[PDB]
RNA sequence: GGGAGAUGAAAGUCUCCAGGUCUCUCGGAAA
RNA sequence: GUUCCGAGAGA
């Protein structure tokens, strides 16, 4: 992705977009009894913790574009993935506006708790002023789609979240690209049934984990990914995508049966205009992080990428033997023979992708089930039933979360949620976590789930 | 580095408004 | 399993 130009809003006529410049995260009652390094991300260009220029850091992710047109390898990769998807029998017809707005069994309703985006937010119109779940009314939606149309600019915001202290000093906060409600509705109408099919089928047919529940899906991953496991990380995946990968995604949608009119909507994701503060800018390439379908389209593109890298790098690859599961840029994959991911990473560079060893390990090709992660979780066989695999969120990550809060009233729910992540690490580690929680009065008053009950409920899921 | 307010001589400080797409999970209430 | 409300995690 690459910024094509930047203009003042006084030139384009767009409304200014401003979001919170102070964090909602504060130290919790556990802040001092657990260790941690993370703090709230920089939200303001004058944050005294910065050691670099803020806005230069924010937009450095737009590293540029390489290819714009699929080569033979990307074409062959796209068709291979498309052929694999045909067994899902995705319904390519338009989803009704009522279903796109108010949801289905496998597609959640539009989130009425978040911004309606451009221009509604700058005009004080909320999603709930347009959508009503008690009536499932679509007349007001159609009125505002006629009034304001489609392909509205994305509204750029800085995400309020914990970041490592080195990302604080380097100004590496993450940007949110808020979709206009009009475009979320329109993409959901075009692709809503594909969303449903992916959500209902996490695994190696979609090549996607969207919709998975790690508590049970982890035991499936070694069965879905047999053979020689491999994995790697991307640096700035979303913004590094060149237009070629959107053309590749179009090839996939066309091949599985979408009309040209539906396929053409992807150009409105490849090419987007954005408003940040008082400026409008044009971005060619790059997945806009807050568009409808971000995680699925990122996951589909990852399936195309790895296929293309394999057949461009190595001779005699049989893509039918590739197994992979992506969640956006995150991935785990396998193949019947070990493959040299350093060589794959070199090919990735030609395509404008920056691939690095999985989980900041020093070199490629040392991934195994004992050290693999996915969705920040490791894989730990149960001691009694080794065919059942615990997802292990590292305790260090759970400690970072417990040290901050948006509201001390949330402490009971927050801690219980972390307990359901922590106990997979084992009885000893869980009891140490619970003991530290109970060393202050607020924690000693909480209801904390019992390890043996947690594990017994987990075993019953199978 | 926005809007409105409070306080203040100001610098500041403080309150509310303003902050995506999705998935999974827990909790409260309800039929 | 459903609905509304609140929360946590992940991409
Ligand atoms: Mg499902
Ligand atoms: Mg990973
Ligand atoms: Mg301000
Ligand atoms: Mg608000
Ligand atoms: Mg519930
Ligand atoms: Zn443009």
Author numbering: 1 to 462
Article passage:
The 3D (also known as 3Dpol) protein is an RNA-dependent RNA polymerase (RdRP) that plays the central role in viral RNA genome replication, and has become a major target for antiviral studies. In summary, we identified a nucleobase-binding pocket in enterovirus RdRP by crystallography and analyzed its relevance to polymerase function through in vitro biochemical characterization and cell-based virological studies. Taken together, this pocket contributes to RdRP EC stability and virus proliferation, likely through its nucleobase binding capability.
The crystal structure was solved at 1.8 Å resolution in space group C2 by molecular replacement using previously reported genotype-B EV71 RdRP EC structure as the search model. The final model had Rwork and Rfree values of 0.181 and 0.214, respectively, and the crystallographic asymmetric unit contained only one EC. The high-resolution nature of this structure allows identification of a total of five ordered magnesium ions associated with this EC, interacting with the upstream (two ions) and downstream (two ions) RNA and residues of the catalytic motifs A and C in the palm domain (one ion). Hydrogen bonding and other hydrophobic interactions involving index finger residues N18, T21 and S45 further stabilize the guanine base, with side chains of residue S45 interacting with the guanine-specific N2 position and residue N18 interacting with the purine-specific N7 position (right).
